Scaffold this active site. Structure first.
Site, PDB file in Angstrom:
ATOM      1  N   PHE A 203       0.830  -1.196   0.000  1.00 43.22           N
ATOM      2  CA  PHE A 203       0.000   0.000   0.000  1.00 43.22           C
ATOM      3  C   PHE A 203       0.864   1.246   0.000  1.00 43.22           C
ATOM      4  O   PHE A 203       1.791   1.366   0.805  1.00 43.22           O
ATOM      5  CB  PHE A 203      -0.931   0.026   1.213  1.00 43.22           C
ATOM      6  CG  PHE A 203      -2.052  -0.968   1.141  1.00 43.22           C
ATOM      7  CD1 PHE A 203      -1.825  -2.299   1.423  1.00 43.22           C
ATOM      8  CD2 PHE A 203      -3.316  -0.574   0.739  1.00 43.22           C
ATOM      9  CE1 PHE A 203      -2.845  -3.199   1.350  1.00 43.22           C
ATOM     10  CE2 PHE A 203      -4.343  -1.481   0.652  1.00 43.22           C
ATOM     11  CZ  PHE A 203      -4.107  -2.789   0.962  1.00 43.22           C
ATOM     12  N   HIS A 291      -9.425  -3.310  -9.489  1.00 45.52           N
ATOM     13  CA  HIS A 291      -8.594  -2.834  -8.396  1.00 45.52           C
ATOM     14  C   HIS A 291      -7.441  -3.796  -8.137  1.00 45.52           C
ATOM     15  O   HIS A 291      -7.680  -4.987  -7.892  1.00 45.52           O
ATOM     16  CB  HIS A 291      -9.378  -2.644  -7.106  1.00 45.52           C
ATOM     17  CG  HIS A 291      -8.497  -2.363  -5.937  1.00 45.52           C
ATOM     18  ND1 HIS A 291      -7.826  -1.169  -5.787  1.00 45.52           N
ATOM     19  CD2 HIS A 291      -8.138  -3.135  -4.886  1.00 45.52           C
ATOM     20  CE1 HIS A 291      -7.108  -1.210  -4.682  1.00 45.52           C
ATOM     21  NE2 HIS A 291      -7.280  -2.392  -4.115  1.00 45.52           N
TER      22      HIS A 291
END
Length: 377
Positions: A203, A291
């Site tokens: 992330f 995604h």
């Protein structure tokens, strides 16, 4: 207004510090005081190598951790610090991205009627939506939708809402911003939370803004995509597979190792519901914005749908140059699609194809499915 909700401009922005992945095991384990944990550091180097993430842009530097070392721990009370940082910096990035999108769109801010602003971070009253209004010089009459902590599928949620706001108000123009910082989720390594090893491997930070309007004045506005349809669904009995709570220690983070197969396992249903109305069957005939929760999610999607080698090119490239930026990620990929499509002179903004699918996967487990229609170049 008559026609569909249309993406007219896209802007993105990231924190100014870039972190090369080759060198991140050393860094992350140094600032958290974990470099003697060589077993776990090695494990993390493996996760990072196979991540397929080459760079990320992160707002947490070593400087902030020296000022807020509670954040560099695992477990310690740290929310207040994270909060001080994020209620400030989540709106600043949003303003950067919104600025660039408003410049692309090119009309005065007078004309923006609504603001939808999604963030994991900086939960405060007034919300960061208000801060953004003040920083950009938005009209005080702007109708706001503040979506805190959605999060990883939020890219779909905001388009789904924006559709109905733009399409039920003639002349409305919606400013949409996903602004994601990993300040709230970052914490030191432990063998007691491998999910955060994954997390601090994939992330990264980033903000994406976009301007939606229906019936665009083609004198002045250039539509990029149209939002044909937007559905959401819950994957049955999969709560607790993607998890996180706002606690004293920050935002906790859990992703099950089954999430890739869960999404691949459930994707055909969503995609069938969304595309039988168009009589569309062949999943290689539509362009793709899935995604990139990680490389395994994409691998399983390719395998299940029998997708050709090129399909996920744009998605993959964003994952490598930026990492997983939660809601913003799919929006970044939109930008990568329309730009790549132009630099490669395709017939449409959607890689030469007419129809595309955009999917967010997140807590629930939730699948946000949005049918886009590409615009002719």
């Amino acid at each position: 207004p008559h026609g569909l909700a249309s993406i007219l401009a896209i802007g993105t922005a990231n924190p100014s510090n870039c972190f090369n992945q080759d060198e991140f095991p050393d860094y992350s384990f140094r600032v958290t005081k974990s470099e003697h944990l060589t077993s776990l550091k090695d494990k993390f180097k493996r996760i990072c190598e196979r991540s397929t993430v080459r760079k990320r842009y992160l707002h947490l530097t070593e400087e902030l951790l020296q000022e807020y070392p509670s954040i560099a721990t695992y477990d310690a009370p740290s929310l207040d610090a994270r909060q001080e940082i994020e209620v400030a910096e989540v709106p600043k990035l949003a303003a950067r991205a919104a600025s660039r999108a408003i410049e692309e769109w090119g009309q005065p801010k007078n004309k923006i009627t609504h603001l939808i602003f999604s963030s994991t971070s900086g939960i405060e009253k007034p919300g960061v939506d208000c801060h953004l209004v003040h920083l950009l010089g938005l009209p005080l009459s702007v109708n706001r939708v503040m979506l805190y902590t959605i999060g990883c599928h939020a890219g779909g949620t905001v388009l789904r809402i924006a559709k109905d706001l733009a399409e039920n108000n003639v002349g409305s123009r919606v400013l949409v911003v996903c602004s994601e910082l990993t300040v709230m989720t970052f914490r030191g390594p432990s063998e007691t939370d491998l999910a955060n090893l994954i997390r601090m491997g994939i992330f990264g930070d980033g903000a994406a803004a976009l301007i939606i309007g229906a019936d665009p004045d083609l004198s002045i506005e250039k539509p990029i995509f149209e939002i044909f349809s937007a559905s959401q669904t819950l994957v049955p009995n999969t709560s607790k597979a993607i998890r996180g709570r706002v606690k004293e220690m920050g935002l906790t983070f859990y992703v099950d190792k089954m999430v890739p197969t869960l999404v691949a396992s459930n994707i055909e249903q969503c995609l069938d519901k969304a595309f039988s109305p168009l009589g569309i069957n062949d999943w290689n005939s539509i362009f793709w914005i899935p995604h990139p929760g990680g490389p395994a999610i994409l691998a399983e999607i390719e395998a299940k749908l029998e997708l050709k080698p090129g399909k996920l090119r744009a998605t993959r490239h964003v994952l490598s140059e930026y990492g997983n930026m939660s809601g913003a990620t799919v929006l970044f990929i939109l930008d990568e699609m329309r730009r790549r499509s132009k630099k490669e002179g395709k017939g449409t903004t959607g890689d030469g194809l007419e129809w595309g699918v955009l999917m967010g996967f997140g807590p629930g487990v939730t699948v946000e499915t949005i049918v886009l229609r590409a615009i002719s170049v």
